[PDB]
Symmetry: D2
Subunit: 125 residues, 4 copies
């Protein structure tokens, strides 16, 4: 029922070699797993997020976001990343994101708690 439900659902890969597996729900839900090719991470982590299930029909992308807390049965990196971005459909479909990775810190170290970057996800590679 969601406009890009079919387009978003599936496996995505970013420029670092990380793998994102997501199911988009009719209502706007995103659920899946994330596996990072870098950092203090191993195997799959739970992700959850939201997307605009009724986007503009004027060539605009579809806004979405999701979160991974970097705790699973193997490791705990005491941190969470949120990706905020848009899905762009078509022959070379893309999810273009910026992200914020916050670590748990003392109050004294909170100024250096948050990394920022950008990931581009594609259906191939």
């Amino acid at each position: 029922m969601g406009r890009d439900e079919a387009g978003i659902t599936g496996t995505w890969y970013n420029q670092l070699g990380s793998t994102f597996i997501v199911t988009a729900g009719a209502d706007g839900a995103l659920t899946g797993t994330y596996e990072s090719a870098v950092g203090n991470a191993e195997s799959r982590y739970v992700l959850t997020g939201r997307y605009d299930s009724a986007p503009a029909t004027d060539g605009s992308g579809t806004a979405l976001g999701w979160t991974v807390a970097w705790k699973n049965n193997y490791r705990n990196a005491h941190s969470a990343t949120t990706w905020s971005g848009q899905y762009v459909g078509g022959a070379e479909a893309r999810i273009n994101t910026q992200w914020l990775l916050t670590s748990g810190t003392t109050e004294a170290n909170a100024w250096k708690s948050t990394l920022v970057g950008h990931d581009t996800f594609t259906k191939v590679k």
Copy 2:
């Protein structure tokens, strides 16, 4: 079972007058609703996210994040915000965040798609 499950669960208010209502699950899940006092928003929006359910015990905060897609039964702002931050417990408990708000745009306008800011949430006011 989550260390700050009790501490995170409940109603939070930020510096803009927005209201965040969240339930923290034992496993790391965050579920709830968000009501923004500003922007192209009215009433409650679904949120989902994740938190570190077993944080460090050295005075460090608890990493977490969540997403709101700004579509509900009243409005659709074709955008999504992700908050990335940490929960700090105690007498004046806080969730200190930075956020990324991405709008759906054409490819030509993608350079101006994403706002960034910071929200501090407290249990009062």
Copy 3:
């Protein structure tokens, strides 16, 4: 000649206890020194930046930004911070900023090169 040339010029202090000393030029130039209370820093560092020397007169703030490269005669932290923000005049004058702190890294570590945060500067404390 710049509208907030007088208002911006002088000594500013942020929430971390850092000290910013700046001279605003008529043309839009910012020149001065920065001393950080935190991180891999000691004593004063050169800063340079720019501000809007003819801002809107509708209660709006004055856009500005500046850069510090964290090399001086004492230390080199192989990094640079840029602050982007606005000056708000009046009895409790403020410079409200967000910043990006990029470290020199290998290409493999570039994903974790950039910290993000927010500093508020006041004329007192």
Copy 4:
């Protein structure tokens, strides 16, 4: 005298078609002009910034940053962008950046004052 003084100095182009012309000083100064291919901008704007004039020699990039206030003789967009990033030398030399673009706003609208993005600059195209 600066390690990458020669490498940084010159004309750079980003993915939007914008042109950055910079001179790197021996001491760490960056001076030049910026011409944006997008947004509320026309012709050249003054930029100033800083770079690490003695970077690490372990394959690491060179940290740098600069600011443009979007006022010149043609237009005033009541805003300033800061780019924070690193210069990576070699056959395909790059300046990889993230940026913050703050507009002058009322206090009520300050939450939506700041855009964030990322630009990659190359010596060709």
